[PDB]
Design an enzyme around this catalytic site. Structure first.
Site, PDB file in Angstrom:
ATOM      1  N   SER A  79      56.628  -0.137  42.930  1.00 47.36           N
ATOM      2  CA  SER A  79      57.285   0.514  41.814  1.00 47.36           C
ATOM      3  C   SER A  79      56.558   1.818  41.507  1.00 47.36           C
ATOM      4  O   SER A  79      55.502   2.091  42.063  1.00 47.36           O
ATOM      5  CB  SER A  79      57.206  -0.418  40.616  1.00 47.36           C
ATOM      6  OG  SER A  79      57.876   0.118  39.500  1.00 47.36           O
ATOM      7  N   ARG A 328      61.109   0.352  48.510  1.00 47.15           N
ATOM      8  CA  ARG A 328      61.829  -0.789  47.947  1.00 47.15           C
ATOM      9  C   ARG A 328      63.191  -0.316  47.468  1.00 47.15           C
ATOM     10  O   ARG A 328      63.363   0.838  47.055  1.00 47.15           O
ATOM     11  CB  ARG A 328      61.081  -1.346  46.747  1.00 47.15           C
ATOM     12  CG  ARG A 328      60.834  -2.820  46.788  1.00 47.15           C
ATOM     13  CD  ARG A 328      62.093  -3.584  46.801  1.00 47.15           C
ATOM     14  NE  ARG A 328      61.832  -4.990  46.527  1.00 47.15           N
ATOM     15  CZ  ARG A 328      62.757  -5.944  46.573  1.00 47.15           C
ATOM     16  NH1 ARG A 328      64.013  -5.647  46.888  1.00 47.15           N
ATOM     17  NH2 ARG A 328      62.427  -7.196  46.299  1.00 47.15           N
ATOM     18  N   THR A 364      61.351  -3.253  34.555  1.00 48.97           N
ATOM     19  CA  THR A 364      60.261  -4.214  34.452  1.00 48.97           C
ATOM     20  C   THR A 364      60.269  -4.953  33.114  1.00 48.97           C
ATOM     21  O   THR A 364      60.162  -6.186  33.071  1.00 48.97           O
ATOM     22  CB  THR A 364      58.909  -3.505  34.633  1.00 48.97           C
ATOM     23  OG1 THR A 364      58.911  -2.823  35.888  1.00 48.97           O
ATOM     24  CG2 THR A 364      57.748  -4.503  34.592  1.00 48.97           C
ATOM     25  N   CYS A 525      66.621   3.350  57.411  1.00 46.87           N
ATOM     26  CA  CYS A 525      65.462   2.472  57.339  1.00 46.87           C
ATOM     27  C   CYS A 525      64.214   3.320  57.157  1.00 46.87           C
ATOM     28  O   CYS A 525      63.999   4.300  57.876  1.00 46.87           O
ATOM     29  CB  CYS A 525      65.288   1.669  58.601  1.00 46.87           C
ATOM     30  SG  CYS A 525      63.667   0.950  58.639  1.00 46.87           S
ATOM     31  N   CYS A 550      59.039  -4.025  59.598  1.00 46.44           N
ATOM     32  CA  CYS A 550      59.827  -4.176  58.385  1.00 46.44           C
ATOM     33  C   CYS A 550      58.962  -4.292  57.137  1.00 46.44           C
ATOM     34  O   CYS A 550      58.064  -5.121  57.094  1.00 46.44           O
ATOM     35  CB  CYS A 550      60.709  -5.413  58.512  1.00 46.44           C
ATOM     36  SG  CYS A 550      61.756  -5.772  57.071  1.00 46.44           S
ATOM     37  N   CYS A 553      62.215  -3.856  52.333  1.00 47.14           N
ATOM     38  CA  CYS A 553      62.820  -3.168  51.195  1.00 47.14           C
ATOM     39  C   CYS A 553      64.257  -3.609  50.942  1.00 47.14           C
ATOM     40  O   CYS A 553      64.784  -3.434  49.836  1.00 47.14           O
ATOM     41  CB  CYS A 553      62.751  -1.658  51.392  1.00 47.14           C
ATOM     42  SG  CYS A 553      63.943  -0.990  52.571  1.00 47.14           S
ATOM     43  N   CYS A 556      68.642  -2.061  54.552  1.00 43.54           N
ATOM     44  CA  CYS A 556      69.575  -2.188  55.662  1.00 43.54           C
ATOM     45  C   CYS A 556      70.680  -3.201  55.390  1.00 43.54           C
ATOM     46  O   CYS A 556      71.814  -3.000  55.813  1.00 43.54           O
ATOM     47  CB  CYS A 556      68.833  -2.576  56.935  1.00 43.54           C
ATOM     48  SG  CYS A 556      68.278  -4.304  56.942  1.00 43.54           S
TER      49      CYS A 556
HETATM   50  C1  FAD Z   1      60.505   3.594  43.436  1.00 43.85           C
HETATM   51  C2  FAD Z   1      60.646   2.644  42.250  1.00 43.85           C
HETATM   52  C3  FAD Z   1      60.221   3.088  40.989  1.00 43.85           C
HETATM   53  C4  FAD Z   1      60.303   2.240  39.823  1.00 43.85           C
HETATM   54  N1  FAD Z   1      59.812   2.781  38.637  1.00 43.85           N
HETATM   55  C5  FAD Z   1      59.862   1.932  37.537  1.00 43.85           C
HETATM   56  C6  FAD Z   1      59.313   2.458  36.307  1.00 43.85           C
HETATM   57  O1  FAD Z   1      58.818   3.590  36.115  1.00 43.85           O
HETATM   58  N2  FAD Z   1      59.365   1.523  35.227  1.00 43.85           N
HETATM   59  C7  FAD Z   1      59.895   0.212  35.267  1.00 43.85           C
HETATM   60  O2  FAD Z   1      59.923  -0.565  34.334  1.00 43.85           O
HETATM   61  N3  FAD Z   1      60.402  -0.208  36.407  1.00 43.85           N
HETATM   62  C8  FAD Z   1      60.385   0.602  37.502  1.00 43.85           C
HETATM   63  N4  FAD Z   1      60.918   0.079  38.767  1.00 43.85           N
HETATM   64  C9  FAD Z   1      61.437  -1.212  38.794  1.00 43.85           C
HETATM   65  C10 FAD Z   1      60.633  -2.406  38.892  1.00 43.85           C
HETATM   66  O3  FAD Z   1      59.855  -2.338  40.069  1.00 43.85           O
HETATM   67  C11 FAD Z   1      61.573  -3.593  38.913  1.00 43.85           C
HETATM   68  O4  FAD Z   1      62.716  -3.731  38.032  1.00 43.85           O
HETATM   69  C12 FAD Z   1      60.890  -4.976  38.828  1.00 43.85           C
HETATM   70  O5  FAD Z   1      59.726  -5.133  39.609  1.00 43.85           O
HETATM   71  C13 FAD Z   1      61.841  -6.041  39.258  1.00 43.85           C
HETATM   72  O6  FAD Z   1      61.198  -7.288  39.182  1.00 43.85           O
HETATM   73  P1  FAD Z   1      61.252  -8.735  39.464  1.00 43.85           P
HETATM   74  O7  FAD Z   1      60.390  -9.453  38.543  1.00 43.85           O
HETATM   75  O8  FAD Z   1      62.701  -9.146  39.565  1.00 43.85           O
HETATM   76  O9  FAD Z   1      60.630  -8.738  40.937  1.00 43.85           O
HETATM   77  P2  FAD Z   1      60.187  -7.800  42.012  1.00 43.85           P
HETATM   78  O10 FAD Z   1      59.065  -6.943  41.637  1.00 43.85           O
HETATM   79  O11 FAD Z   1      61.387  -7.187  42.632  1.00 43.85           O
HETATM   80  O12 FAD Z   1      59.582  -8.910  42.917  1.00 43.85           O
HETATM   81  C14 FAD Z   1      60.257 -10.001  43.527  1.00 43.85           C
HETATM   82  C15 FAD Z   1      59.145 -10.804  44.241  1.00 43.85           C
HETATM   83  O13 FAD Z   1      59.719 -11.872  44.856  1.00 43.85           O
HETATM   84  C16 FAD Z   1      59.195 -12.094  46.177  1.00 43.85           C
HETATM   85  N5  FAD Z   1      60.282 -12.719  46.946  1.00 43.85           N
HETATM   86  C17 FAD Z   1      61.555 -12.198  47.266  1.00 43.85           C
HETATM   87  N6  FAD Z   1      62.321 -13.007  47.952  1.00 43.85           N
HETATM   88  C18 FAD Z   1      61.504 -14.119  48.088  1.00 43.85           C
HETATM   89  C19 FAD Z   1      61.691 -15.381  48.718  1.00 43.85           C
HETATM   90  N7  FAD Z   1      62.805 -15.683  49.320  1.00 43.85           N
HETATM   91  N8  FAD Z   1      60.669 -16.279  48.682  1.00 43.85           N
HETATM   92  C20 FAD Z   1      59.499 -15.964  48.051  1.00 43.85           C
HETATM   93  N9  FAD Z   1      59.204 -14.824  47.422  1.00 43.85           N
HETATM   94  C21 FAD Z   1      60.258 -13.936  47.476  1.00 43.85           C
HETATM   95  C22 FAD Z   1      58.913 -10.654  46.588  1.00 43.85           C
HETATM   96  O14 FAD Z   1      57.938 -10.616  47.618  1.00 43.85           O
HETATM   97  C23 FAD Z   1      58.452  -9.950  45.333  1.00 43.85           C
HETATM   98  O15 FAD Z   1      56.991 -10.080  45.147  1.00 43.85           O
HETATM   99  C24 FAD Z   1      60.863   0.908  39.992  1.00 43.85           C
HETATM  100  C25 FAD Z   1      61.298   0.482  41.305  1.00 43.85           C
HETATM  101  C26 FAD Z   1      61.190   1.296  42.393  1.00 43.85           C
HETATM  102  C27 FAD Z   1      61.644   0.725  43.692  1.00 43.85           C
HETATM  103  S1  SF4 Z   2      64.773  -4.170  55.048  1.00 46.48           S
HETATM  104 FE1  SF4 Z   2      65.935  -3.030  56.673  1.00 46.48          FE
HETATM  105  S2  SF4 Z   2      65.533  -0.911  55.922  1.00 46.48           S
HETATM  106 FE2  SF4 Z   2      64.062  -2.110  54.788  1.00 46.48          FE
HETATM  107  S3  SF4 Z   2      62.290  -2.031  56.111  1.00 46.48           S
HETATM  108 FE3  SF4 Z   2      63.339  -3.921  56.774  1.00 46.48          FE
HETATM  109  S4  SF4 Z   2      64.588  -3.313  58.475  1.00 46.48           S
HETATM  110 FE4  SF4 Z   2      63.996  -1.306  57.522  1.00 46.48          FE
END
Ligand code: FAD
Ligand code: SF4
EC number: 1.5.5.1
Length: 581
Positions: A79, A328, A364, A525, A550, A553, A556
């Site tokens: 994030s 991501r 978040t 990707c 991979c 993220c 794809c």
């Molecule tokens: C570039 C970017 C910038 C961002 N900037 C901000 C910001 O400034 N402020 C803010 O509040 N938010 C921001 N966000 C958003 C924030 O990251 C998310 O909304 C938040 O983390 C989503 O959380 P979550 O708790 O659903 O899980 P996530 O953080 O998405 O985590 C899900 C977890 O589940 C695990 N998981 C997934 N599938 C499985 C499975 N099948 N089995 C076991 N484990 C699994 C993953 O490995 C991961 O650790 C940003 C996101 C990105 C990509």
């Molecule tokens: S999820 Fe798809 S786009 Fe993301 S890293 Fe893996 S293969 Fe590449």
């Protein structure tokens, strides 16, 4: 060998139908719990934490198991991280003395519109959604790490390295729980002498916190017609890197954003640049591209790398050192895309469903709140009696009731017409005009709700109709290539295992994609996993999938025009090794 039967994963070729598995014993050991949580991210932790707090308070026995793909908690968290403390402080009011890493309160908010040569400053007023007073910029990965610690302390059973790869159902049809990935299978599908069956975690209710575009939720949506009354979730892809800069250009607590160059008015996206204040002159910066883009020749990564060269941004990283890289996918659908969150035996929380405040780019704080509510409502039903039967798996419908009445609901409602207003003739510039009218002035009061253009996958035009984009060559100091980048993410997987990027039909990437769109998987990707290799000899090419690179993220599975790809989990522990990303 051939074409080459690129797909061998058991999800497409069940080992209960291939002879090579004739004598293997698929018996799994099973563990019983009250609540199983899938994903150790902000939401999953919030749920886990809150449940054990409730258990302790009313002193009752609650077994709560939390599974995670990552080698260790926070390893897969990516994030930019600008945090709204609202839900976090609710969960840990005692946070300042327990150590939580909220060390960078936001001090300056900046926003600008870029052109190839200039930066146009945009005034940011006190009503607007890009305000950050009272907010902190953090290293989400570290914060999550910290939370996992508290969880463990509260008695939550955390299992890092265990990925949920299968949904377990009861005979009535409700969710019984999950099973962790198996282990010891070779690239071709054959069982290894080291084959071992995964674990079975049975619960009364399973929480799914897989984050943006979880692979289990994906099949969960179908099974229980959860998207029946909403528009399909739309996404964006976020690329990020960590930098160590000149203490002279470090301005701790500053938060920057931009829109425009290098994107064209019709491609949603922009950057974010945050100055951490944790000791070193460290920068957290990135780029986002709406996966609803039309040109097949566009590359989110090359766009990102290209962006850092703007004369308004280059000087800041000039003579700096880049120390990390990652990517991501994130939600952009907002309000219009929230599906039905409950079904017999399980709940959806966090960004898996999608509580993202897109204009703010914050998901978040809502993610956490949803975990809190989920936990409260589940405790409420294990602590009562009043049986809801003929579903051995609870249906905590009260979770959704309560979520709709929380600030989360009204927060997303208020900014629901922002992203959609970008589909005009002025693209995102028109969306900015909308923000000043209908939001700054009417705070989203307007009596209507705009719609999305539909799925990001059918938004790609054929190659022959578009003009290819000529991206610069990386200079190795400000812009880098894809491989040095993948290296700086620390991602790795056992090479000898079937590719987790599964294909429904091994012929479409060459017949359809490369043919019509000129193989977009080779450019959307961010880790160079897909490449089109010339054929030994004759003509044409073949698709080569380097599954080892991979970074999970999920982009794809989302962007493929042929919706032929289905991201599945590789052996647990595989993937990025992010540190404070
Ligand atoms: C570039 C970017 C910038 C961002 N900037 C901000 C910001 O400034 N402020 C803010 O509040 N938010 C921001 N966000 C958003 C924030 O990251 C998310 O909304 C938040 O983390 C989503 O959380 P979550 O708790 O659903 O899980 P996530 O953080 O998405 O985590 C899900 C977890 O589940 C695990 N998981 C997934 N599938 C499985 C499975 N099948 N089995 C076991 N484990 C699994 C993953 O490995 C991961 O650790 C940003 C996101 C990105 C990509
Ligand atoms: S999820 Fe798809 S786009 Fe993301 S890293 Fe893996 S293969 Fe590449």
């Amino acid at each position: 060998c051939k074409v080459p039967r690129i797909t061998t994963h058991y999800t497409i070729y069940p080992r209960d139908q291939d002879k090579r598995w004739e004598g293997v014993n698929m018996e799994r050991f099973a563990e019983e719990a009250d609540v199983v949580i899938v994903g150790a991210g902000p939401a999953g932790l919030s749920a886990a934490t809150r449940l054990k707090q409730l258990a302790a308070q009313h002193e009752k026995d609650l077994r709560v198991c939390l599974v995670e793909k990552a080698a260790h908690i926070g390893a897969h968290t990516l994030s930019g991280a600008c945090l709204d403390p609202r839900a976090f402080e609710e969960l840990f009011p005692d946070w300042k003395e327990k150590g939580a890493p909220l060390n960078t309160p936001v001090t300056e908010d900046r926003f600008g519109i870029l052109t190839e040569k200039y930066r146009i400053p945009v005034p940011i007023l006190p009503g607007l959604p890009m305000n950050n007073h009272g907010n902190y910029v953090v290293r989400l990965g570290h914060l999550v790490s910290w939370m996992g610690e508290q969880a463990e302390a509260l008695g939550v059973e955390v299992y890092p390295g265990y990925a949920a790869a299968e949904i377990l159902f009861h005979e009535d049809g409700s969710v019984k729980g999950i099973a962790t990935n198996d282990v010891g299978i070779q690239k071709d599908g054959a069982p290894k002498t080291t084959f071992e069956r995964g674990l079975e975690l049975h619960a009364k209710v399973t929480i799914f916190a897989e984050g943006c575009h979880g692979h289990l939720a994906k099949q969960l949506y179908k099974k229980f017609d959860l998207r029946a009354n909403c528009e399909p979730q739309t996404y964006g892809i976020g690329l990020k890197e960590l930098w160590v800069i000149d203490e002279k250009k470090w301005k701790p607590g500053r938060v920057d954003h931009t829109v425009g160059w290098p994107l064209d008015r019709h491609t949603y996206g922009g950057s974010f640049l945050y100055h951490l204040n944790e000791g070193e002159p460290l920068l957290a910066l990135g780029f986002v591209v709406g996966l609803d883009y039309q040109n097949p020749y566009l590359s989110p990564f090359r766009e990102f790398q290209r962006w850092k060269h703007h004369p308004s941004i280059k000087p800041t990283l000039e003579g700096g050192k880049r120390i990390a890289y990652g990517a991501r996918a994130l939600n952009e659908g907002g309000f219009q895309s929230i599906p039905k969150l409950t079904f017999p035996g399980g709940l959806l929380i966090g960004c898996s469903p999608g509580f993202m405040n897109v204009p703010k780019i914050k998901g978040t704080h809502t993610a956490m709140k949803s975990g809190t509510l989920a936990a409260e409502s589940i405790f409420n039903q294990l602590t009562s009696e009043n049986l809801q039967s003929k579903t051995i798996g609870l249906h905590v419908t009260e979770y959704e009731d309560n979520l709709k009445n929380s600030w989360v609901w009204k927060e997303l409602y208020s900014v629901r017409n922002i992203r959609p207003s970008c589909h005009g003739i002025l693209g995102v510039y028109g969306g900015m005009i909308y923000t000043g009218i209908f939001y700054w002035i009417f705070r989203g009061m307007e009596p209507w709700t705009l719609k999305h253009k539909g799925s990001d996958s059918d938004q790609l035009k054929p190659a022959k109709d578009c003009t290819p984009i000529e991206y610069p060559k990386p200079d190795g100091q400000i812009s880098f290539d894809l491989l040095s980048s993948v290296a700086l993410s620390g991602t790795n997987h056992e090479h000898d295992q079937p590719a987790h990027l599964t294909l429904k039909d091994d012929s479409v990437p060459v017949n359809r994609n490369l043919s019509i769109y000129d193989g977009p998987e080779q450019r959307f990707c961010p880790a160079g996993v897909y490449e089109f290799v010339p054929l030994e000899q004759g003509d044409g090419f073949r698709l080569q999938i380097n599954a080892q690179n991979c970074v999970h993220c999920k982009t794809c599975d989302i962007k493929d025009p042929s919706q032929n790809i289905n991201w599945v989990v590789p052996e647990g522990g595989g993937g990025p090794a992010y540190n404070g990303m």
